[model samples]
Target: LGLSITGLGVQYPPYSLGPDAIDILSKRYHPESPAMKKVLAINRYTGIDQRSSIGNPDHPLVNKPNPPTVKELHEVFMSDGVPLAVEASRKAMAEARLVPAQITHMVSTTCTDSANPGYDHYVAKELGLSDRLEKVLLHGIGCSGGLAALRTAANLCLGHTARGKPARILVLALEVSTTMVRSELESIDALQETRIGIALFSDCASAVILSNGIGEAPGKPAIYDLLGWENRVIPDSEHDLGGDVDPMGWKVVLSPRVPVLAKASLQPTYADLLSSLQDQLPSSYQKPADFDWAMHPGGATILSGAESAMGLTPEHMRASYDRYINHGNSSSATIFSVLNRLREKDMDALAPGGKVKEYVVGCAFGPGINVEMCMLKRR
Candidate 1:
């Protein structure tokens, strides 16, 4: 009666980087300047040790006088992007016990890089997916995009099966944040944003395959029946986390207001998402604090907003933290990496069976001040 997350895969860029933000930014900012100190402090706040990127930059992302043009950056993305995505898809397919030919649809997402014909076309081609694959390509959804792809894939699998047209959908979330690095602009805003990117962002590509199991096996990761999903854009808070598309390319902007706004949305967003799915929860532990959380590790502030709001311990959100320390924030692909860690640790905990003994609540904050959340049951 539900779809299952039968397969999962993740891929990182060949480049691995430590939280050497200050050492790296020294290439652009005068190392002794107040701005340089700010970068170092932010890097420490991120609690990141290593990050990966498409390019093993000889210098930091932005050089003082010389900056890579948008086209040049895009070329770097095209160089290794498809292969990274394919690697993830292969793992997902292999884990799901599926073959390319069995995939009826391909849903891919990425916000940090853009290529003509996009990532899905090439990924489907390389994987030899069905020529008739229904492709839904999502661009620029930011950190919440992985969950967006999952919801879309689940819907397709559920609908097609309900209509007797069995379908399998492979969803991918990929980001190459280093690709969008820019030369510092004179504007206070752009410079501040570039610093944020340099400090908090990294690279990743991840995939998950979903199919209607209806009456099939009972022990795979159905993502807890792929229950309901919710997406809400906080009213009038649209500017908290968007960027401008200038000649330099897409630059990530974070208003000082972001953490405050995100914190405000915690309860309403959490409550709203689970409102319709209460029956799927365990009646024995009937309180907000009872559920496991998969809140996106957008940054220290975002994590703080969720952790404090729900009173979650470090262990409750440990996957997000561990991934941050090791991989930096890979944007859209980050959450899947966290979920992958959860599954590997305890499949039953991540996706359970029978009556719901435990539940998972996942949420992500994005531009538009958008909030995306979902719930899952674990027996």
Candidate 2:
């Protein structure tokens, strides 16, 4: 029996801010800095109309003269982010029609928050999952963490299926990314570099349920079959993208060269993915246009770069562009939001010939310049 993504759920904070929020945030953080002015100007072209945040941008905590400490931020993440995670988890489990006790394993990932127990521990407890549940939490991978968590869940699902046992693995990725706006603004002032990261991130939590083909209830349908995947780090590109812990939160480091490096990675990773799925895919499906895509909306340039490199049209990445414009980039949670968008009625991407394909390609780029690609078949 193969592994399948039986359900998915995505949740964002109630506070939604438009691009003009950039101006307010920029002024609040650096009222008289020219670089901050540049950041404000750059936000106009980000192609993002709105983004969600856990905290209101106009609140005293956000606009205060002094930013919150790391400990203070972490406390907020656990208090707010964990509930977001629990809500997403419940939605996924509900779609799968499974109770908390029915889930045997849980896997989670995030680059925005770190805690001793990890958010997954609290999420599991809040969801009332079994006391014997196996849990794994992934950190440091940034945007690629969503696919990384899915890959881990796939392997865990296979392990139990291989042993002729049932496995229902819950995968979660959450990020309260906007809270770092102050840190990013400070970085721009201190580093004297105009970083677009401050304008590019938001908050979201996404959950997915992966089921091994054993002991599942009848009529349970999979959103996508887990086919194959590949992971690789671009050589000598570690400095291109990452984040470091800071008093306010993490200071994101995003090189201007990241879009180019990320674009150049597509074909090679896609080639390896095709090879891994050889004979498993149709012979006609030989190129990027041959399948729909669920791409991480890293930024405007990254999305357009992927289109230029793969000879794909914007329609081929409809969900990517739509999610980016509507939700902004929520780090690891963005890909799952894109995937969920693809499965939405009347929102699926179509091939060049104007028909939806059975197989979809999912890819995301993260720190390490890490590239993660996976193949999924519509079920």
Candidate 3:
């Protein structure tokens, strides 16, 4: 009785700010100062070519002296971010051959906005989902949110399927991170530290449809079968990462030690996940290299650290690096983009084994210094 991911969809905002805009953006944030050089240097190797944004990078709301307030940001998020969520949801549903009314539950996560009724409600409304649909909104989970939402949806799917009731769950992760660039820059200038958070975030919405196979839809495809999951919080690292609500929307608190803390926990968490799924795995699945990876590209350091820790080559994490280099980190929505990318037929040529692996390891670290590790069987 496994939950299968039947469909995946990823959508980005209309505008993009590329690497070429670095000089312009850096100058706007820091004028004729040495800090501007530091900003430019830091942006160079973030592994991002460009990142999607809801508003133009040069707009006053983003680069002007007065940072956008929470209310102002919230308005933009509703007007812009929510539609991406709806669009992604529609694509997933279409792929799953599911109608809005067929969805039984929705699990969504985001750290980009804190709103009453939450973004899920608006997304649900726009999708015309049944009012009776069970909805769960997860917040503050940070970067590991996409997997966390899927984990939650898997449990929901299991519960309904256990009773022989059909369960088709829609999982969504959305972020409007680019709008907070001004606030992050303000923190960087005030603290006079090279906070890299400002260098790595964009806007995106990713959705996945998970169903318990007892459903009625014909020709429903399975992308990956959920095998197992492991989640743990790193001790004493609570302050290492967080998104604290503020007058200027939210402050991203990312400690320099985050990479080390996250890297150190990967092996043990992954080992535990494999141990839990031992019965479901083939005898040949002994080494980490045997499986493909969908790692969250939190930053270059984190990716490098994982490579050393897990003995994985670039090809094993090709999808991870590709998304990072192209999309930057759209917070929680990023993992789905990687997952969607990994499932593409073209990715097979880039796989470590010269073909897509039978199994995939989906891993991410979030605000709690929380580590999420899961097993996915390719279908």
Candidate 4:
């Protein structure tokens, strides 16, 4: 039996960081210096109007070259990041009609921070879940972890369990990059990565339930059927995109080649996936023009790259664009927010009285040059 996404929920911190005020720099870069100016221009070009964050990316201290301590960054993730995950989990459970007591497993994903009993544990306890609940914690995978959780959740339900009774798994993906927590940057390469983070990173926590889909409700975004998933990795390109651990904490790097690489790999990834599922997907549905695309929208440039690569009209990427414009990039938690926006009836771009939009092709990218795709179909 396959799984479906029964309920989805998202939580954001109170603070707001938008393009208008998007200015932060590393101390070694100096004020209005070359590096600082680069950061400023990237921030403006992101097409993101606003984002939610607990700490200011524009703060004088965070932008400095002499970044904060790993301990301090950990504390920020502890105080701010963990709670957001718990809150989002609570809402998701409630929506799925799966009580804390009923949930059999909890899966958590984040590229930032750590928890003692772990994030899922705290979330389960707070939600009144059982102490016996099984937990899986994945760290440092970066943006693609959210979709990875979906694959894990589905397999957990199908592969194991007492008597195939229930496979109700809660998947939570959280990101707090704006807190600028983690390892210190000391080189020009590090400075480049920091600038990318400043331009796109934001804070948010998102939770969803994967099951033999519970039910559907009116006046809400349509829940998703977990159709199938595929992952791709580009060889010899480890440094193209990834996170680095250092004396302070962790920081991510986004090479200038990222946009080009992402654009180049789009079709090969898609072809490899669908061609393997010859029986499940029809050849007619293979082209992107025939389906709505919920690409990762990693940044303004990435979005443009995917659009150009796929030869899609502005309408096809409306969901991705809308989320990017409103939320910047929250890493692993972003595509969920974009998928949530696709629930709006008016949000679609296809002909009103023409062919109904039934297929959604979704994808997200991450470190190790990894690409993840989930072929979703509307019931």
TM-score of each: 0.88, 0.96, 0.96, 0.87
lDDT of 4 by residue, 105-161 (tens): 888898876657666676677778888888898875699888887778877876554
Each prediction's RMSD to truth: 3.7, 1.5, 1.5, 3.7
**Colliding residue pairs in candidate 2:** none
lDDT of 3: 0.86
Which candidate, 1 or 4, has the higher lDDT? 4
Residue-pair clash count for candidate 2: 0
* TM-score, candidate number 1: 0.88
Between 1 and 2, whose lDDT is larger? 2
Q: Over 4 Å off in model 3, which ranges?
A: 20-22, 63-65, 218-220
Q: Mind giving the per-residue lDDT tens digits that candidate 2 earns over 1-379?
A: 4789888999988987788786777766675677877888898889999888897778555676767778877877998888899999999999888998889999999998878888899999999999999999998799999999999888899899889988999999999887777778777877778888878899999999999979888666888998998999899888889998777778887887898899999989999999877788888688998888899999888888988999888888888988899889999999888988887766743445667778899999999989999999887
Candidate 3 has a TM-score of: 0.96
The local lDDT score (0 to 100) that residue 316 gets in candidate 1 is: 64
User: What is the model-wide C-alpha lDDT for candidate 1?
Assistant: 0.72
Model 4 Cα displacement at 346 (Å)? Answer: 3.9
- Displacement of residue 376 (Cα, Å) in model 3 is 0.9
lDDT of model 4 at position 219: 38
lDDT tens per residue, model 3, 309-339: 9998988999999888878888899998999
Model 1, residue pairs in steric clash: 1-214, 4-222
Q: Put down candidate 1 lDDT per residue, 113-221, tens digits, no spaces.
A: 6667887888898889888889999866788798888887877887888788767788898887765544432222334433566777888999987778753344655
